[PDB]
Amino acid sequence: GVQFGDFIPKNIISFEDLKGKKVAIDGMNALYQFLTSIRLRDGSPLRNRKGEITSAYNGVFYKTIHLLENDITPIWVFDGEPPKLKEKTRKVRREMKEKAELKMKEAIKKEDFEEAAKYAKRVSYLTPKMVENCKYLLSLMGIPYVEAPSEGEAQASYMAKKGDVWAVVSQDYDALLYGAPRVVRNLTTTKEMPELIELNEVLEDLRISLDDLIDIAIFMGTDYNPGGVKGIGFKRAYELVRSGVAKDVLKKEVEYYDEIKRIFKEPKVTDNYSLSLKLPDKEGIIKFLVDENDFNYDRVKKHVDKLYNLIANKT
Ligand SMILES: [Mg+2]
Numbered sequence: 272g273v274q275f276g277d278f279i280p281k282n283i284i285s286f287e288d289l290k291g292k293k294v295a296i297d298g299m300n301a302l303y304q305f306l307t308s309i310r311l312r313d314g315s316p317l318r319n320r321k322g323e324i325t326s327a328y329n330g331v332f333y334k335t336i337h338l339l340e341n342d343i344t345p346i347w348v349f350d351g352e353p354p355k356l357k358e359k360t361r362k363v364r365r366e367m368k369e370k371a372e373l374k375m376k377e378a379i380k381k382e383d384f385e386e387a388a389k390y391a392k393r394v395s396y397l398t399p400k401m402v403e404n405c406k407y408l409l410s411l412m413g414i415p416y417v418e419a420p421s422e423g424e425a426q427a428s429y430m431a432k433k434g435d436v437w438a439v440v441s442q443d444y445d446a447l448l449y450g451a452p453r454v455v456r457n458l459t460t461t462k463e464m465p466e467l468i469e470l471n472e473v474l475e476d477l478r479i480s481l482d483d484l485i486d487i488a489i490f491m492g493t494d495y496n497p498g499g500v501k502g503i504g505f506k507r508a509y510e511l512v513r514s515g516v517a518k519d520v521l522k523k524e525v526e527y528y529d530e531i532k533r534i535f536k537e538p539k540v541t542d543n544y545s546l547s548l549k550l551p552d553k554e555g556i557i558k559f560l561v562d563e564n565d566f567n568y569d570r571v572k573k574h575v576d577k578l579y580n581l582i583a584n585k586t
Pocket residue numbers: 272273443445494
């Protein structure tokens with residue numbers, strides 16, 4: 272996401288100081304994280320005997336239990352319906368290139384079949400099936416999840432602002448742009464220590480408003496305007512913001528500036544979800560993990576036993 276890291280205040284926090292907090296996990300960010308970091312010695316992903324990747328299932332299972340063991344109650348947040356994701360104020364223009372220039376012409380020729388074998392790949396190793404399988408596993412584990420109307424980071428941020436959860440868990444800083452009061456990094460990955468970023472601290476320290484921060488992100492470049500504004504990094508953007516000339520510059524330099532701003536300010540969110548935990552289906556977990564995905568029975572068994580006890584106590 273936006274490379275805010277070096278320019279915003281952040282603090283290393285211990286796992287103990289995270290004890291008892293409820294958090295909204297950015298599901299897609301977490302799953303991509305697992306695929307990247309849960310690999311073999313040769314950098315190859317974890318797979319079952321059928322050659323299917325299980326890296327994501329490994330992180331979902333073990334990472335979720337790790338948090339619960341430390342009294343951190345997670346609620347997984349996933350992205351909305353790929354076909355339709357227009358988030359309340361997110362339909363005016365596009366969510367891709369469907370409406371506008373996407374090219375309609377007869378080209379079924381070989382270049383279309385080598386291509387008709389060239390569409391299921393850029394969806395990375397994280398396929399809808401895999402994402403669906405992760406949702407299934409969370410269900411068996413008794414862990415609550417929400418399917419956001421659109422971007423999961425907006426849903427999670429909303430949940431944090433509401434106070435249903437203490438922070439958004441992700442490796443990206445982007446939740447701050449949606450008004451998330453707190454983001455906690457390095458929980459799904461522990462190379463480095465957990466890192467807590469508080470939005471209010473960032474704003475007070477930099478002496479800027481949330482709208483200013485969104486402006487800086489747009490200069491740098493968001494998923495909605497990759498590459499940002501020609502030759503402008505954090506410092507120059509922050510300079511333009513403090514001078515009070517950012518909004519004029521952005522209106523000139525970024526088409527759909529007002530549209531991009533609305534995405535962060537008025538996303539489509541939902542209140543239909545529960546943070547309640549359910550006792551885990553031990554047998555179904557073992558079938559899916561051990562039987563169908565070749566996880567080690569012993570380790571899995573000890574873990575579903577631990578999971579059940581934790582939830583029971585919590586419940
Ligand atoms: Mg992002």
